């Protein structure tokens, strides 16, 4: 393999490009809810999946980007739309796009302390519902919590356990 790292970043909200002020995105930490399981006839617990836990997807700006502040705490939860684009350029030329479509609730607008001579750093946080990650257009993740879609690399990992819940 070739060495491949992040160089540049972008953010869209409702189609509006934040080409000027996003210093820091953060993709939501995907994590299996692990319960360490030791039972009769074994030791060293084996950690059966229970599903995911909630996915805060923080990011920040440092201007008063009012196109982003209006999405805080609406009556319509899961109305914040947005993609976390990013390009991993590698060493041999070609840049691999990594995008991440969100649909969640902007739950925390956190202005920093204003020390009058530094950056403002409006740290935000969306507690996402829908989460679709692409790598060079090819599909890797879909996390739709309501109505039960977890598609890892295109195959729905809940499909075997959704046709017996009757969903």
């Amino acid at each position: 393999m070739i060495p491949q790292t992040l160089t540049n970043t972008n953010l869209f909200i409702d189609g509006v490009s934040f080409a000027g002020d996003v210093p820091s995105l953060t993709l939501p930490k995907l994590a299996v809810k692990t319960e360490q399981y030791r039972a009769g006839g074994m030791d060293a617990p084996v950690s059966i999946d229970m599903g995911l836990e909630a996915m805060e997807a923080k990011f920040s700006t440092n201007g008063a980007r009012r196109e982003a502040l209006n999405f805080f705490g609406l009556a319509d939860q899961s109305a914040f739309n947005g993609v976390f684009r990013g390009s991993f350029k590698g060493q041999k030329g070609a840049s691999v796009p990594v995008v991440a479509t969100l649909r969640g609730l902007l739950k925390e607008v956190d202005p920093g302390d204003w020390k009058a001579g530094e950056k403002a750093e409006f740290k935000y946080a969306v507690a996402v519902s829908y989460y679709k990650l692409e790598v060079d257009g090819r599909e890797v993740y879909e996390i739709d919590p309501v109505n039960g879609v977890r598609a890892i690399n295109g195959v729905d990992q809940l499909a075997g356990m959704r046709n017996d819940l009757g969903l």
């Binding site: 490009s17 080409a19 046709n163 017996d164």
Partner: protein
């Protein structure tokens, strides 16, 4: 005398209907009656800031102020308005609106809108004569007025049947006009009667609003009209309808209103014969980048042409044009001096030629949702499994 202390005054006010401020100056010309209230000479333009100066310079029931309150509901814009005197016959009332150099030295009518500049620092980028645009004589002269100012002249069709304004919008291949057919009915402060406003000042007030935050490059079609109820003629828009009143008026290059009680405009295309100049952004960005190229290079229109004068402004005409690409006004451009039209004999008399080659953002007229109800996802679904 005076009053010391504090004074509560039982007044009659109401309907704080504030709008975000605008910057695009429009011109205006309609009838008003100069009695003792209206402190404005009937042939010279006055500059209007808000509802206070619109009601101080013109009468409350005057057709100027009924059109001035149509824009200040929507955008806190800058009005250059030259009123005209009310006449009797429609022939003589039209000729008072066009006018010209019919005085001994000065100008009257529509032609006093070139005097917005050099009195007010306000070049009118929009033209609207509310009600006096359904006649052929004014609308021929409003386009010749809008070509000199390099502006967008707003008209209206007649308030007749649908096929009349289609027959009225065939007299113009004028590439700077804009026609809004259905007459807006407005409430006007506990009337219980809807006044048929001409809907040329409301649509000209929408352009100054969308100039502010969506940008001049933004298509001024889908956006809201305020201060408006159910209009004169109901223009529906039905999808897949060959003879619906919107598409019958869109193909005739006429803006309409579509949604409930005239929520929003519907015209994306201007009254043109060329297909290159079809949209109302390809002609609006064509003019409103070239005042922004100029305002920013007003120093370059007189200066000694040295060895570096051609080069330091062609790296300054680019250096402003990247800001339009930064805010999404254009796509990639190229701005460069002509190699084949810059000689020393042209430079000796001052003349020097540059090229500017940008391309504009195309507005999203007609999204298309082609959809089949399949029987596809039925087999693996709906089973015991």
């Amino acid at each position: 005398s005076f009053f010391h202390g504090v004074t509560v005054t039982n007044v009659d006010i109401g309907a704080r209907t504030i709008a975000l401020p605008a910057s695009s100056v429009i011109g205006l010309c309609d009838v008003f009656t100069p009695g003792a209230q209206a402190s404005a000479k009937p042939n010279v333009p006055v500059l209007l800031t808000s509802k206070k100066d619109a009601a101080a310079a013109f009468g409350i029931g005057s057709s100027i102020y009924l059109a001035c309150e149509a824009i200040y509901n929507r955008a806190q814009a800058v009005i250059v308005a030259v009123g005209v005197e009310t006449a009797e016959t429609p022939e003589a009332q039209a000729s008072a609106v066009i006018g010209g150099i019919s005085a001994a030295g000065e100008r009257t009518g529509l032609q006093a809108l070139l005097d917005g500049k050099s009195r007010f620092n306000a070049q009118p980028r929009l033209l609207v004569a509310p009600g006096h645009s359904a006649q052929q004589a004014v609308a021929t002269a409003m386009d010749g007025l809008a070509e000199k100012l390099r502006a967008i002249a707003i008209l209206d069709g007649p308030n007749s049947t649908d096929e009349a304004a289609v027959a009225y919008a065939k007299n113009f291949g004028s590439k700077r006009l804009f026609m809004v057919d259905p007459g807006v009915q407005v409430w006007d402060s506990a009337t219980n009667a809807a006044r048929n406003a001409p809907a040329s000042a409301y649509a000209a007030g929408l352009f100054a609003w969308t100039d502010a935050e969506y940008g001049f490059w933004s298509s001024p079609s889908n956006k809201e009209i305020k201060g408006v109820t159910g209009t004169s003629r109901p223009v529906e828009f039905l999808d897949g309808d060959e003879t619906c009143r919107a598409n019958l008026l869109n193909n005739a290059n006429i803006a309409t209103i579509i949604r409930d009680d005239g929520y929003r405009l519907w015209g994306n295309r201007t009254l043109s014969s060329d297909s290159k100049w079809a949209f109302v952004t390809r002609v609006r960005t064509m003019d409103l980048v070239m005042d922004a190229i100029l305002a920013g290079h007003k120093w370059a229109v007189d200066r000694g042409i040295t060895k570096t004068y051609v080069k330091d402004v062609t790296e300054g005409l680019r250096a402003f044009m990247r800001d339009l690409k930064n805010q999404g006004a254009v796509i990639n451009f190229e701005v460069y001096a002509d190699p084949d039209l810059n000689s020393a004999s042209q430079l000796a008399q001052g003349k020097v030629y540059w090229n500017i080659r940008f391309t504009d953002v195309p507005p999203a007229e007609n999204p298309n949702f082609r959809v089949e109800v399949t029987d596809q996802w039925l087999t693996e679904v709906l089973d015991v499994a």
